[PDB]
Amino acid sequence: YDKWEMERTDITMKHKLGGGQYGEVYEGVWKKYSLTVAVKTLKVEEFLKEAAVMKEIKHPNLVQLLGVCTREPPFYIITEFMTYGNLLDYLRECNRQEVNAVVLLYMATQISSAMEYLEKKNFIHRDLAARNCLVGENHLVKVADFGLSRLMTGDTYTAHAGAKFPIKWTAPESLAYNKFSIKSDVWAFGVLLWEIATYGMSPYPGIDLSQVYELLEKDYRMERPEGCPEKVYELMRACWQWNPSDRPSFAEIHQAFETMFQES
Numbered sequence: 001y002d003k004w005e006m007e008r009t010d011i012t013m014k015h016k017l018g019g020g021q022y023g024e025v026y027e028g029v030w031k032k033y034s035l036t037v038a039v040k041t042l043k044v045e046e047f048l049k050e051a052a053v054m055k056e057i058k059h060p061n062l063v064q065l066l067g068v069c070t071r072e073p074p075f076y077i078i079t080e081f082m083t084y085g086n087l088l089d090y091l092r093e094c095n096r097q098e099v100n101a102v103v104l105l106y107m108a109t110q111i112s113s114a115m116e117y118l119e120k121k122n123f124i125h126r127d128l129a130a131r132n133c134l135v136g137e138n139h140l141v142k143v144a145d146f147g148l149s150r151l152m153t154g155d156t157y158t159a160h161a162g163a164k165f166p167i168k169w170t171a172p173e174s175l176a177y178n179k180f181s182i183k184s185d186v187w188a189f190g191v192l193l194w195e196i197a198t199y200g201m202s203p204y205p206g207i208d209l210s211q212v213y214e215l216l217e218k219d220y221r222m223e224r225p226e227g228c229p230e231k232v233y234e235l236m237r238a239c240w241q242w243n244p245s246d247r248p249s250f251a252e253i254h255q256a257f258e259t260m261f262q263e264s
């Protein structure tokens with residue numbers, strides 16, 4: 001039992017978070033600080049592996065581990081709770097006059113900061129998308145990884161290479177050779193930017209999954225969405241270079257957004 005172990009009685013367990021939306025994740029209260037928290041429970045090797053990774057990740061724009069309970073079952077991983085929930089539903093439901101261009105820029109800047117941190121620490125996300133991001137008060141955004149490929153119903157994830165892939169977020173070299181890297185996260189970030197610019201539309205709208213790889217290999221890319229600043233679309237296209245080594249680093253992306261943000 002290490003530094004992160006907390007006593008189970010420190011947490012008040014309430015209902016499943018979203019009533020089952022996230023699997024075995026519960027809304028809780030960290031009583032001594034009057035804070036709402038999220039609590040993932042084991043309904044083992046992989047569970048503890050996730051906790052070990054999260055002990056190494058500390059950044060304002062990444063979901064923050066608060067503690068674990070590992071002395072008796074059920075095991076808990078406890079994180080902060082984010083008031084406004086996941087970014088995809090937030091974008092689809094928000095007041096667009098409040099969530100204007102400078103706010104969307106601010107959210108993209110924060111996500112790129114989180115990814116620059118993972119890049120610096122030699123982590124790979126592998127499933128970056130608006131559905132894996134969270135929104136808090138004052139337009140805070142945090143990147144998370146909810147393990148959605150096993151949870152979500154619908155066509156977001158579909159069978160490929162013997163697993164479940166979010167095809168329309170997946171870099172070509174990942175689709176073709178199952179090669180994942182920080183550069184395939186850069187590709188997914190470009191799709192995430194498009195989700196932000198459209199307030200959460202599904203990407204390649206109207207295009208069947210069966211066509212996506214062929215179109216990408218033949219240099220098709222989503223056109224600039226309505227109202228998207230040209231400089232932001234320029235960054236999108238750079239994220240979608242066919243060769244992973246031609247894509248910018250997250251350090252470069254964040255620098256670009258930071259410059260854009262302070263000039264606004």
Ligand SMILES: Cc1ccc(NC(=O)c2ccc(CN3CCN(C)CC3)cc2)cc1Nc1nccc(-c2cccnc2)n1
Nearest residue numbers: 022025038039040063077079081082085124125126144145
């Ligand atoms: C309760 C919990 C337990 C674990 C996690 N873990 C992560 O979010 C995560 C993030 C990044 C990594 C990094 N990792 C690097 C390696 N690659 C391959 C995978 C990613 C791992 C786990 C989150 C949570 N939090 C969580 N889970 C589900 C829903 C919510 C939630 C929902 C609504 C409002 N507020 C919070 N909050």
Ligand SMILES: O=C(NC1=NN(c2ccc(Cl)c(Cl)c2)C[C@@H]1CCO)c1ccncc1
Nearest residue numbers: 100101104105108193196197198226227228
């Ligand atoms: O104008 C539309 N979207 C928009 N994207 N912009 C933007 C700005 C910064 C980033 Cl970083 C990204 Cl990604 C995108 C701004 C603009 C909205 C603000 O005016 C829009 C029109 C019609 N339907 C849906 C959306």
